[PDB]
Amino acid sequence: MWSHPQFEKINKMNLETCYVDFLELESHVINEDYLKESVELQKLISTLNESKFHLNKIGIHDFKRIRELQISLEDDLTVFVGDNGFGKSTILDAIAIVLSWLRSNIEKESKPGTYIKSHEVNNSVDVEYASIDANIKLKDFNTSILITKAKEGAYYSRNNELLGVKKLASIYRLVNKYVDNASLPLMAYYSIARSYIGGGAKTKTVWSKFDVYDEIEFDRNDFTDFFQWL
């Protein structure tokens, strides 16, 4: 999210390098006519289009009933099978938690997301904190994120890691700044509370693509807006 003297090293074609080459070219040229036709913007757009969104792996430590485990998810479909009380909803909650910070940073930078509730930490005596880790791999590019919370009453501090998701969100905002109809990824969550909306606004006029980023969860009023949209 900054400009550099373009360190060279060995030659490669990573998306990060194209991102920083466009930023380097930004500081010299001022006229937007040259910018809109520069080959660096074409390279960045072409690289961004062919990448496919994919969550690689996830690890849960000392969260709810789960003590420690790592999961690898397939790129098209994965199914979890178990009985009652085996932490099926815990995994989905963890994924939505780590996906909310990426949701928040796209609308506006340095905006907070979702934290860990104080009753979600394990009830064992020997525990001190809880953590969640993740990884996102778009083509060659890899990012990571860690969310953690210390047990109430302790006197030792732990903080979050947020450099990767902020760097990734900046690329999307920059691309959207120079493209008329740039697309965005889709994130959704259908919890068990969707049966309440089973058939149970000041003349809305303007429709945009940023209204679907208000929340990561489908609840309550989203049915009403569907009728208005239809």
């Binding site: 550099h4 991102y19 920083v20 420690e68 990571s144 994120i145 732990r158």
Partner: protein, 308 residues
């Protein structure tokens, strides 16, 4: 007596030394440095007057504080090459990393280790030590001191601090056929037995809590590797045969640079840059210059070396 030696060596009077004592923590400069990629880093470095006294201080405590032999950082006659020679003949490797290692050392934990070693020091020397090797960020009423990095005395202090952790973990790893080594805030394990490396994450956490409270493990920088993937230890690649290497990409890059130099298309800056890189690679491998000589001839190599 320690304050007398420092006063006598620098011929400081009573008033001057006292004036420096209570203003020493704030003589730091904070600046940013570029990152390889995108971003920036934060550094804080003292002034010239405080640096040459910090270096003098570390000379007195060097022969009095024991340091474990499994730490391969900021040590005389030790480098990366000696670090990678331990794991050069094992199959499975696991790597871990701490979280904000340098700002978790405080005078509260520093003086506790000093008391345990059996060395008794006066209260005046305690005051001098507390107000000289530590940094105070924030306002003047923060009353919080952190060791920091970029100061001449921090690297040595960290090694002495983690002596108990090194000793308690080394003999546990020895009993199970596991190799262990630490570089700054990196810890590496390696072994040949299958399914034995999945238990050490809980052990390191237990020893971490038992010996040095406050420290914690970053859980997003843990790596498992084998012989079917890329293996390297702090920047040196391990051939599956079991030999150290620099990498094929750099070998081809240096060959291209020399070939272009043979046509006289290399600027003066790149001559110095490539000469330094070649010297480092020659030290790492030991037979790089022979290969270059057998390709471009001894005369061209000698002329290139003698240039400048």
């Amino acid at each position: 007596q320690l304050t007398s030696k420092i006063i006598s060596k620098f011929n400081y009077n009573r008033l001057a030394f006292q004036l420096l004592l209570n203003e020493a923590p704030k003589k730091y400069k904070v600046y940013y440095i570029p990152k390889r990629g995108a971003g920036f880093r934060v550094i804080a470095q003292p002034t010239k007057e405080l640096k040459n006294v910090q270096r003098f201080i570390v000379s007195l405590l060097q022969p009095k504080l024991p340091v474990h032999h499994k730490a391969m950082a900021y040590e005389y006659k030790k480098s990366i090459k000696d670090n990678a020679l331990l794991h050069k003949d094992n199959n499975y490797i696991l790597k871990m990393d701490f979280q904000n290692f340098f700002n978790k050392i405080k005078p509260d934990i520093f003086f506790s280790k000093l008391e345990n070693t059996g060395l008794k020091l006066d209260s005046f020397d305690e005051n001098t030590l507390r107000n000289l090797l530590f940094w105070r960020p924030g306002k003047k009423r923060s009353t919080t001191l952190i060791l920091s990095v970029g100061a001449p005395s921090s690297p040595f202090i960290s090694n002495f601090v983690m002596y108990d952790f090194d000793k308690s973990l080394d003999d546990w790893c020895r009993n199970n056929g596991i190799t262990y080594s630490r570089y700054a805030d990196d810890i590496t394990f390696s072994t040949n037995i299958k399914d034995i490396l999945c238990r050490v994450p809980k052990v390191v956490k237990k020893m971490l809590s038992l010996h040095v409270p406050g420290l914690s493990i970053n859980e997003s920088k843990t790596i498992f590797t084998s012989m079917a993937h890329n293996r390297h230890v702090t920047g040196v690649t391990l051939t599956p045969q079991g030999n150290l290497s620099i990498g094929r990409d750099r070998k081809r890059m240096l060959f291209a640079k020399i070939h272009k130099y043979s046509l006289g298309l290399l600027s003066s800056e790149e001559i110095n840059k490539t000469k330094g890189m070649i010297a480092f690679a020659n030290y790492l491998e030991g037979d790089f210059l022979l290969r270059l000589q057998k390709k471009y001839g001894c005369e061209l190599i000698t002329k290139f070396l003698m240039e400048g």
